[PDB]
Design a protein around this ligand. Sequence first.
Ligand SMILES: O=C(Nc1cc(Cl)c(Cl)cn1)[C@]12C[C@H]3C[C@H](C[C@H](C3)C1)C2
Length: 169
Amino acid sequence: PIGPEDVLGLQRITGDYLCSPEENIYKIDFVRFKIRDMDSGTVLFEIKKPLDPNAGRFVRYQFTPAFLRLRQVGATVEFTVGDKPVNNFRMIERHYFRNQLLKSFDFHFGFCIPSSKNTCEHIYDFPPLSEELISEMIRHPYETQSDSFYFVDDRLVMHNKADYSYSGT
Ligand SMILES: O=C(Nc1cc(Cl)c(Cl)cn1)[C@]12C[C@H]3C[C@H](C[C@H](C3)C1)C2
């Protein structure tokens, strides 16, 4: 049984998925994701959802070098929920570069309407990165990786993974 305290101190990306897809007993399905730069209004990324072991749990992002100097980005997330009520829906997203923790985001979802489509806004406050780190992250695309742990009532129900490029394609 993995709880939030079990991931709040992780200093490395996990070597595997901490939970199976069947553990998503709340039928939580992310159907849309949009990232906006809060200092310019620019839509940095948008996706709409229409046997690989990842099965939709791994996403690869391709951003520009300017993304690493952003102060704050806004994430709009659309997701459906099953019949089971969802209380204390939490997401802990940890970003690492070459086994070095860079930032962890602890987001608490607002009320979730059961058996319906929900929309939430997550505000990411980026920390200032050292010039050496920014340079390395630009030179090494996809070596920046993240773990997104989703908790419902302190119980891990979803675990998604991603890697990032900041080389501007
Ligand atoms: O990729 C990142 N943040 C991100 C990515 C997405 Cl796809 C969304 Cl939705 C929201 N934030 C960062 C940028 C830099 C500052 C931290 C630590 C690392 C360097 C990785 C976050």
